[PDB]
Design an enzyme around this catalytic site. Structure first.
Site, PDB file in Angstrom:
ATOM      1  N   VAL A  49       0.864  -1.212   0.000  1.00  0.00           N
ATOM      2  CA  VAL A  49       0.000   0.000   0.000  1.00  0.00           C
ATOM      3  C   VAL A  49       0.889   1.247   0.000  1.00  0.00           C
ATOM      4  O   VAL A  49       0.475   2.261  -0.595  1.00  0.00           O
ATOM      5  CB  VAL A  49      -0.968  -0.008   1.195  1.00  0.00           C
ATOM      6  N   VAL A 103       4.663  -0.808   4.109  1.00  0.00           N
ATOM      7  CA  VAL A 103       3.290  -1.080   4.629  1.00  0.00           C
ATOM      8  C   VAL A 103       2.519  -1.974   3.651  1.00  0.00           C
ATOM      9  O   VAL A 103       2.537  -1.686   2.431  1.00  0.00           O
ATOM     10  CB  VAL A 103       2.522   0.224   4.913  1.00  0.00           C
ATOM     11  N   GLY A 143       8.292   4.120   2.429  1.00  0.00           N
ATOM     12  CA  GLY A 143       8.901   5.367   2.927  1.00  0.00           C
ATOM     13  C   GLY A 143      10.236   5.102   3.598  1.00  0.00           C
ATOM     14  O   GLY A 143      10.663   3.928   3.622  1.00  0.00           O
ATOM     15  N   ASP A 189      -0.272   9.189  12.988  1.00  0.00           N
ATOM     16  CA  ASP A 189       1.055   9.719  12.554  1.00  0.00           C
ATOM     17  C   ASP A 189       1.554  10.855  13.462  1.00  0.00           C
ATOM     18  O   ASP A 189       1.818  11.997  12.986  1.00  0.00           O
ATOM     19  CB  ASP A 189       1.061  10.168  11.089  1.00  0.00           C
TER      20      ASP A 189
END
Ligand SMILES: NCc1ccccc1Oc1ccccc1
Ligand SMILES: [Cl-]
Ligand SMILES: [Cl-]
Ligand SMILES: [Cl-]
Ligand SMILES: [Cl-]
Ligand SMILES: [Cl-]
Ligand SMILES: [Mg+2]
Length: 348
Positions: A26, A34, A29, A164
């Site tokens: 998905v 993920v 980074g 986050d």
């Protein structure tokens, strides 16, 4: 101990308990990789994050511990929670990999509001939920530090969770120029005026609430200095009392070079908005952070009359952050992280 299976996903080995099926990438980074999965134990669709290089330096090993401590603590309807944490290692000696499991999030606040305004009833409910979540976060002496629309998950029923949290120093490049990463930051942190505290989050809530009411970014500066001129034009240039609280001499000298401006009329800026919405914005968007409304105070403001329930706005258990001033070796942060992985109790 569950049985684990291995598979390679876009040049990355994933070793996960059998309960997690149908893994599909998905996102990727600096932080990690993920996958979406189906959790056969709970029936939930989930996000599985594999941390990248969790123990590569002292800085990295400490960030890994910080993130796991924070996610293990947060137990609130309007805040991301930890569903599971696992490692394939059967001992501290072979421990290298950490995997975090959370509820899969479909849409962020940008997806319900990209170049668009909403009804007043939707704005009341959405901002009520952010403040309910912040009252909880702040009661544990946690500062989010990075509230913006892309850090807020929303479902088809307008239900909202904060995610986050700020856990790494943002890069200099990431805050440079015409970027959403800076538009929601309080002036005292954007320009390093003074030691900041939890009031920075309320400045961010003011910027988000303005953008839901108008469908436009409040302070979309092309750089740090342009963004400060947009801010001071709305809320006015600082008085002697705030100028004293700016520890940086050169930041004080720069502000004093600017022609003095009064605070604007918010009823003439937010044309046609509920007068209670205008009043709450004047209480959040205050230049001196000592004078801003707190999340606990804002929940009792008349704008939220139809949602406020003082018996259902809970506070957090105490959170110990004394580890943040501790000088430890890589292997010592790694051992602390391992213990936190093995002691994890799933939610009911
Ligand atoms: N960024 C455009 C915008 C649209 C709607 C409301 C406010 C607004 O920002 C302002 C307005 C006046 C002074 C400072 C910022
Ligand atoms: Cl399993
Ligand atoms: Cl959650
Ligand atoms: Cl491992
Ligand atoms: Cl954003
Ligand atoms: Cl604690
Ligand atoms: Mg984010």
């Amino acid at each position: 101990r569950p049985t684990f299976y291995r598979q390679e996903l876009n040049k990355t080995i994933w070793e996960v308990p059998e309960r997690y099926q149908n893994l599909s990438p998905v996102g990727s980074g600096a932080y990690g990789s993920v996958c979406a999965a189906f959790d056969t134990k709970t029936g939930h669709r989930v996000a599985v994050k594999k941390l990248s290089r969790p123990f590569q330096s002292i800085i990295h090993a400490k960030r890994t511990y910080r993130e796991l401590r924070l996610l293990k603590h947060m137990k609130h309807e309007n805040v991301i929670g930890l569903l599971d944490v696992f490692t394939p290692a059967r001992s501290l000696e072979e421990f290298n990999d950490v995997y975090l499991v959370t509820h899969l999030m479909g849409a962020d606040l940008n997806n319900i509001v990209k170049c668009q305004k909403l009804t007043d009833d939707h704005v009341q409910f959405l901002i009520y939920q952010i403040l309910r979540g912040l009252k909880y976060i702040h009661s544990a002496d946690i500062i989010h530090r990075d509230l913006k629309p892309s850090n807020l998950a929303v479902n088809e029923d307008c239900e909202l969770k904060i995610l986050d949290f700020g856990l790494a120093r943002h890069t200099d490049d990431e805050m440079t120029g015409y970027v959403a990463t800076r538009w929601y930051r309080a002036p005292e942190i954007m320009l390093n005026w003074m030691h900041y505290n939890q009031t920075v989050d309320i400045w961010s809530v003011g910027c988000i609430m303005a953008e839901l009411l108008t469908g436009r970014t409040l302070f979309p500066g092309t750089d740090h200095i342009d963004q400060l001129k947009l801010i001071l034009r709305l809320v006015g240039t600082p008085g002697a009392e705030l100028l004293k609280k700016i520890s940086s001499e050169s930041a004080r000298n720069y502000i004093q070079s600017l022609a003095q401006m009064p605070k604007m009329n918010f009823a003439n800026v937010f044309i046609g908005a509920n007068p209670l919405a205008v009043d709450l914005l004047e209480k959040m968007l205050v230049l001196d952070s000592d004078k801003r409304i707190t999340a606990a105070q804002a929940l009792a403001h008349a704008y939220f009359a139809q949602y406020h329930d003082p018996d259902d706005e809970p506070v957090a258990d105490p959170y110990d952050q004394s580890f943040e001033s501790r000088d430890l070796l890589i292997d010592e942060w790694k051992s602390l992280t391992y213990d936190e992985v093995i002691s994890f109790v799933p939610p009911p």
